[PDB]
Amino acid sequence: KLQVCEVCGAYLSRLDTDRRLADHFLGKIHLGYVKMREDYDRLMK
Amino acid sequence: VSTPELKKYMDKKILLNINGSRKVAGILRGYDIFLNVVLDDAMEINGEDPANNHQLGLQTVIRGNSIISLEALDA
Amino acid sequence: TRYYCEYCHSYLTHDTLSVRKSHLVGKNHLRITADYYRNKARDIINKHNHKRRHIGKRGRKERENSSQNETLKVTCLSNKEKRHIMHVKKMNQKELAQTSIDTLKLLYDGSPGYSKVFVDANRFDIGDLVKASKLPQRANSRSRDETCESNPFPRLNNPKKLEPPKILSQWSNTIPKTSIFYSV
Amino acid sequence: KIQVAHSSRLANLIDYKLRVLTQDGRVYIGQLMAFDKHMNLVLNECIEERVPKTQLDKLRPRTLNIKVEKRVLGLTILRGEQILSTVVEDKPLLSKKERLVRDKKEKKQAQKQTKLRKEKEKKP
Amino acid sequence: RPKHELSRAELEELEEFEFKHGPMSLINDAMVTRTPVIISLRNNHKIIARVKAFDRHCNMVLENVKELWTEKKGKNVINRERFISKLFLRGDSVIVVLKTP
Amino acid sequence: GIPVKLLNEAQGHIVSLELTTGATYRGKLVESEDSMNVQLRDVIATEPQGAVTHMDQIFVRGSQIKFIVVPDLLKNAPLFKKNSSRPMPPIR
Amino acid sequence: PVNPKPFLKGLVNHRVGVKLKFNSTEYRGTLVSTDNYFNLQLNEAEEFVHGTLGEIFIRCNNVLYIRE
Amino acid sequence: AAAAAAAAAAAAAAAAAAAAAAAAAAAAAAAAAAAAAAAAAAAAAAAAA
Amino acid sequence: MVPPINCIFNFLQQQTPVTIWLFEQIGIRIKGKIVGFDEFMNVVIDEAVEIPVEKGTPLGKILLKGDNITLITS
Amino acid sequence: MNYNLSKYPDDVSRLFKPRPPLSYKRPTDYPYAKRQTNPNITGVANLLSTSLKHYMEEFPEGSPNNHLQRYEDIKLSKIKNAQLLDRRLQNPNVDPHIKDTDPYRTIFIGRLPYDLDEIELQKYFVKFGEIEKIRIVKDKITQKSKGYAFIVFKDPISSKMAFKEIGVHRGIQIKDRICIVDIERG
Amino acid sequence: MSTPAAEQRKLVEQLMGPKICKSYLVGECPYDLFQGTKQSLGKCPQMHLTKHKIQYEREVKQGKTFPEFEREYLAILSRFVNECNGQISVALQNLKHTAEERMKIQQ
Amino acid sequence: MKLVNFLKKLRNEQVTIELKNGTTVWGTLQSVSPQMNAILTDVKLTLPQPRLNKLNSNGIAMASLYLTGGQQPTASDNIASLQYINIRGNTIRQIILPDSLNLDSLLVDQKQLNSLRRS
RNA sequence: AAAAAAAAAAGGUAUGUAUUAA
RNA sequence: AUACUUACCUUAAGAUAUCAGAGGAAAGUCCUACUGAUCAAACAUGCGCUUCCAAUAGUAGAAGGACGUUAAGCAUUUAUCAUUGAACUAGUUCAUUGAAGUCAUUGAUGCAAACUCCUUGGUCACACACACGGCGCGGAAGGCGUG
Numbered sequence A: 001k002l003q004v005c006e007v008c009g010a011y012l013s014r015l016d017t018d019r020r021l022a023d024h025f026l027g028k029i030h031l032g033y034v035k036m037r038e039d040y041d042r043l044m045k
Numbered sequence B: 001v002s003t004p005e006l007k008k009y010m011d012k013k014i015l016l017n018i019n020g021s022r023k024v025a026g027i028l029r030g031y032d033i034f035l036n037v038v039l040d041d042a043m044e045i046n047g048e049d050p051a052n053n054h055q056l057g058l059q060t061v062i063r064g065n066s067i068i069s070l071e072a073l074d075a
Numbered sequence C: 001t002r003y004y005c006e007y008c009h010s011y012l013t014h015d016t017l018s019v020r021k022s023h024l025v026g027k028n029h030l031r032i033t034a035d036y037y038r039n040k041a042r043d044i045i046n047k048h049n050h051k052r053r054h055i056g057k058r059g060r061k062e063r064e065n066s067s068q069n070e071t072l073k074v075t076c077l078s079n080k081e082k083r084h085i086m087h088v089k090k091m092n093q094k095e096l097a098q099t100s101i102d103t104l105k106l107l108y109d110g111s112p113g114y115s116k117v118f119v120d121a122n123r124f125d126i127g128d129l130v131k132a133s134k135l136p137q138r139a140n141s142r143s144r145d146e147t148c149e150s151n152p153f154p155r156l157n158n159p160k161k162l163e164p165p166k167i168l169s170q171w172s173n174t175i176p177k178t179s180i181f182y183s184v
Numbered sequence D: 001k002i003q004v005a006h007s008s009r010l011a012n013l014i015d016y017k018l019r020v021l022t023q024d025g026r027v028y029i030g031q032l033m034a035f036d037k038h039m040n041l042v043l044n045e046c047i048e049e050r051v052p053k054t055q056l057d058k059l060r061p062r063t064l065n066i067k068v069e070k071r072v073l074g075l076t077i078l079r080g081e082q083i084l085s086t087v088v089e090d091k092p093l094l095s096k097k098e099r100l101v102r103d104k105k106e107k108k109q110a111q112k113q114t115k116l117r118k119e120k121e122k123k124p
Numbered sequence E: 001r002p003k004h005e006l007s008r009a010e011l012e013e014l015e016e017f018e019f020k021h022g023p024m025s026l027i028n029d030a031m032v033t034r035t036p037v038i039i040s041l042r043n044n045h046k047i048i049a050r051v052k053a054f055d056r057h058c059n060m061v062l063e064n065v066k067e068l069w070t071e072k073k074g075k076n077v078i079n080r081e082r083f084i085s086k087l088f089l090r091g092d093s094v095i096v097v098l099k100t101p
Numbered sequence F: 001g002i003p004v005k006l007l008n009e010a011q012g013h014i015v016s017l018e019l020t021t022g023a024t025y026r027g028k029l030v031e032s033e034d035s036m037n038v039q040l041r042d043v044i045a046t047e048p049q050g051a052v053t054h055m056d057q058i059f060v061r062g063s064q065i066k067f068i069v070v071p072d073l074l075k076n077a078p079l080f081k082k083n084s085s086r087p088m089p090p091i092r
Numbered sequence G: 001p002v003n004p005k006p007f008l009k010g011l012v013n014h015r016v017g018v019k020l021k022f023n024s025t026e027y028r029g030t031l032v033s034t035d036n037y038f039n040l041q042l043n044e045a046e047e048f049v050h051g052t053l054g055e056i057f058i059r060c061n062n063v064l065y066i067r068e
Numbered sequence H: 001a002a003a004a005a006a007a008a009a010a011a012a013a014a015a016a017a018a019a020a021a022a023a024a025a026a027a028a029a030a031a032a033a034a035a036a037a038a039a040a041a042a043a044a045a046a047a048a049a
Numbered sequence I: 001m002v003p004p005i006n007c008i009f010n011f012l013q014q015q016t017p018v019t020i021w022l023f024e025q026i027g028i029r030i031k032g033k034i035v036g037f038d039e040f041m042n043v044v045i046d047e048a049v050e051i052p053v054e055k056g057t058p059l060g061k062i063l064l065k066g067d068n069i070t071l072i073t074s
Numbered sequence J: 001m002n003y004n005l006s007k008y009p010d011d012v013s014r015l016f017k018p019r020p021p022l023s024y025k026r027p028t029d030y031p032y033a034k035r036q037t038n039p040n041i042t043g044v045a046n047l048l049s050t051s052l053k054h055y056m057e058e059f060p061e062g063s064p065n066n067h068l069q070r071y072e073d074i075k076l077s078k079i080k081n082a083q084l085l086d087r088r089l090q091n092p093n094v095d096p097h098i099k100d101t102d103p104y105r106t107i108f109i110g111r112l113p114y115d116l117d118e119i120e121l122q123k124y125f126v127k128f129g130e131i132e133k134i135r136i137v138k139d140k141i142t143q144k145s146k147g148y149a150f151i152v153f154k155d156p157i158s159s160k161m162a163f164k165e166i167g168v169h170r171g172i173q174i175k176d177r178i179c180i181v182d183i184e185r186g
Numbered sequence K: 001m002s003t004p005a006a007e008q009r010k011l012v013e014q015l016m017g018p019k020i021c022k023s024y025l026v027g028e029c030p031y032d033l034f035q036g037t038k039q040s041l042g043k044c045p046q047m048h049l050t051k052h053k054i055q056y057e058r059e060v061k062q063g064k065t066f067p068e069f070e071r072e073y074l075a076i077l078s079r080f081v082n083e084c085n086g087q088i089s090v091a092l093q094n095l096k097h098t099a100e101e102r103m104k105i106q107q
Numbered sequence L: 001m002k003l004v005n006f007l008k009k010l011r012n013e014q015v016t017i018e019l020k021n022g023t024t025v026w027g028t029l030q031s032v033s034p035q036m037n038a039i040l041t042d043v044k045l046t047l048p049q050p051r052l053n054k055l056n057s058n059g060i061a062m063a064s065l066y067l068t069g070g071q072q073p074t075a076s077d078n079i080a081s082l083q084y085i086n087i088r089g090n091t092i093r094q095i096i097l098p099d100s101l102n103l104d105s106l107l108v109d110q111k112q113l114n115s116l117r118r119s
Numbered sequence M: 001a002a003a004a005a006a007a008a009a010a011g012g013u014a015u016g017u018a019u020u021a022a
Numbered sequence N: 001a002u003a004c005u006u007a008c009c010u011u012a013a014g015a016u017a018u019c020a021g022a023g024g025a026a027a028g029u030c031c032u033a034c035u036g037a038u039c040a041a042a043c044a045u046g047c048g049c050u051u052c053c054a055a056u057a058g059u060a061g062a063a064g065g066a067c068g069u070u071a072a073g074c075a076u077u078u079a080u081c082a083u084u085g086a087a088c089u090a091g092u093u094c095a096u097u098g099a100a101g102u103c104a105u106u107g108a109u110g111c112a113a114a115c116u117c118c119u120u121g122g123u124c125a126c127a128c129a130c131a132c133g134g135c136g137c138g139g140a141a142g143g144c145g146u147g
């Protein structure tokens, strides 16, 4: 029971609420992919 | 070897005592493994607060060897 | 290197400030260590001093002066009795440890500055620390701004009368039997 | 007073009450427990003794009685940089034989712990 | 080139070079040629002596040491001399060392 | 070494400091490193001449520390066990 | 963009003064060689604080600055 | 949601963490809607037979 | 974050003049143009003057040891 | 304690109670700002070098260094080793223990047992082809076998085959020993 | 790494001694982000040197601004964007089903 | 080469360890650590008297000397006698070793030869 | 006359979710 | 304890007494439960080896403490700086404005005593014995020596 986040390609359960997900959002993988998406948007302009 | 952990301190206005006598106050910018601390808008505190206090420069760096105690006056 | 945590007895490989900081803050390590110092602390009270005895030769004078004095009877409880009474005494000490009479906080509950002092979260000295003392709260109030304008009359069927002073369980038969006046 | 073993190093002596001299002219007296490569050591119950500036003139050359102001600080950890020299004050609460006894019993208990842990992990 | 890259023997050749060719060659040439050297410590008095040994940290073993120390109080000076046969000197106290002609 | 490990074991407890400048910082220890430089929380400060103040957060350099006073109940802490039995280390 | 070590490699066998940190004493002489710690060797040095000194070894910790 | 995650997390990453949290919640709602549509299609397929 | 020696490298290439305080025992402060530096924070100063603590004498291109450095101030 | 900002609960935190605040004692030492080692070090004087002569006339000749002679012994010994190697290097068309026929057909055997025999080596070397000449290296001071030999064969191809076969695998077993094999190398 | 003077000499040598790489005015590069995580592996091409970085970021103030670095930086980045999207597809294929619908067919 | 390895062969000799304080220690020498930590046995450690018509001696060394517990009350001059002093290495300034021992035998380091004999 | 391929995950700590009984 | 999810991270190097001689695989290395010397540790074991181990034939005493009292003991020395106005000698008092300002003055420094209380020891055995400075059983701490 989980939904894969498009950013980091990793799995996120809906029942773990937010405060656990913050650890996944502040990790190096997810934050890095967050930046790379934004960089793609930078380069599309 | 290990970097000192100032990570919560940076960008906060901080007072720190240079050697025995002196006390410098400035907004912490960066730091290194020797605790060399570079800060901006430095001011040298003295007995008379508005009077004898005189600013140093736009950017000042401090040798970690002369650092005694570092207090942040800030959140 | 490797960091051996001797409280948990479990190794952690290639010590680093991050992983070691995470382990030390960990809940399991927390319980293990706290319990460890609970035992090491209960021991010094548990351990009997057992100081050494030095027996000298009783003199001829005090043997004669102490012989005319009659021998006193000693009382010794049964094993089944002494186990229970030791349990009771220890549980009484644990009670006197946790008492900490707060009644002053109950007296001033409706004072105009009660929110700035006795709430202790919103104070100055201890106020800012409690925030960082809040647990990480992983998964699953009395604001300071109050004024006297709330609760203008402290008594409108609101308050409970002050709790009666306590009494020792042993000597509870010491109490004067009857009150002087008729309460409802 | 007390005779220390003619060859005894800082590792041989534990739990002896020591007398520690720093660069500033103050002394820390207490039981040593651990120490380190750079010789910063851990004292159990220790009291720092100090000769005031006013009593100091009494020590200059001419029975002297010095009033040595001292304060009690328990379980400290010194710094090797400050330490100057170390002297022995007393010998431990336990004799050598008794310490051999408690060492052997402690080791046996330690082995029993490893066995009770190994066989508690293995079957479950 | 930093020292942590080199092997165990490359440090030995490095120290051999530094002693043979380098600043401390002033002391080395002084040890072989039996030339007396003057040494100023940071304690502010000066030994005239002859170097039987020396080392990386500059600590050195000496023979026929002559120590010269003066003291003054309120501009009242006295010169004191103290003779020693053999000595071992820790190298952190020294500042300047000269080789006499 | 054990002396530094005992300082790491004192985190979150009230400790005292003596800096080689002569001051005294007594308060609660938040962080400590293997370089002995510590940072303390809600600390009372005594200047070398006795003037006492209060500051919420402090960071001190370990080289300037002289002695550190640690809660006494850490004396019997497991670091001081002479004969101790560790299991085998995991293979990595 | 000269750094310290090439600056000492460029000052070899040139007349250099060196100010120690204590008495404001400076040794004026022809540099001979330097170590990795910037130990100094000097020829025909003169002590200014007035004298003439044949050969000198200067340990690294006591020097304040080096000039030409 | 802000008071719960604000304590432990640094304040500078609190904003981007909050936006990522809201985005995740929206994605969860979308997945729920898709599941509901699939359920409706299954009901229609059961009614046709 | 701006590491301190990065900031010093910004003193080298930006050619800004700097005043630098020494240890409290010596009693002089140096000022000049920081050219280059080493890992030990010992720096070469071009066109440096030593001021006692404005009649100070000009020094030169001078290598100054990092052991005596207290502040480097623009 | 009241707050106890800690991992531990209230009962464990109140168990760690510190000793009471340290009483204040006025410092008996020099303030950190005043701390310095002795300044105004008198440099080495022309007057000091003038006082040198009293020391020089008293101890004109230094004691000899006998700990350096231990090193000057070993280094000179190394130079003499190099000289003996020089005596050997000047000494294969003269040697005529080595003057046997063309070196292309000369195959070198080594690590042979000192108790070995010419017949067995004639068989093991004869396995790879016909034998032209054979010579066994013995010391000049006495007849003890050095453990090496040179075998000239009728064709160089058979000598190479013997080097590869016999020498390329484990060494060729002869008597109780494994014998290495190669070309003449000289 | 053993002493602070060695690490600091390494950092100063990074400060003071085509190479392209890091490019865009904000941080990035594909590699530098994921070090220590399972995803990215070790040495990466060319050299992200603080000297070149300071030169380029100062040329941002100079404003010469020729986004050839960005035109290489799309060829670098968008490939990783597509890799992540692909991994998403693989995970979506993996997760949803199993032996699964067997029992569901049973239902 | 580490010249401290010389001091480790001076064991069981009468020596004076003259420290940075000016304090001088006469005693029988025991094992010297690689950091030059010097441990002695039967020691008389004192301070010299600068005469110069009463020039105040080291004020810190007098306190550190009385605080060893070894200074006896009736000593007229400033001295102390005690057993087992352990001295940190960085405190040592000079070491005056006896006149009898020969340096040529003790100054030969076995590692220095071992490096040359092996090459 | 000559010829041709490679063998592999590791395992530590922490957090959340589920299971181990009248 | 098991399963899944997420986060944080991964190997400074080398060595285990020295010296010398003989042997095995001209130079060097490695090796010999090989031979000698020296060193170190553990374990035993000895010395007419050294020091210490408290009254009961009495209400004691030795060592070490009090972060104990007398005790506001006795004898000393101390309580912020700057600006403006009034008076004033030729510095002093009062009022206003600003800055910082450990608490204490029953303090702090020096001097000394009395009292009270805590911890510790073989409170062992034989002996109340006119000598020229021993040779009871143990325990503690050392030094030296042999194996």
Ligand SMILES: [Zn+2]
Residues within 6 Å of the ligand: A005, A006, A007, A008, A009, A010, A024, A025, A030
């Ligand atoms: Zn995600």
Ligand SMILES: [Zn+2]
Residues within 6 Å of the ligand: C005, C006, C007, C008, C009, C023, C024, C029
């Ligand atoms: Zn743990």
Ligand SMILES: [Zn+2]
Residues within 6 Å of the ligand: K021, K022, K029, K030, K031, K032, K044, K045, K048
């Ligand atoms: Zn890159």
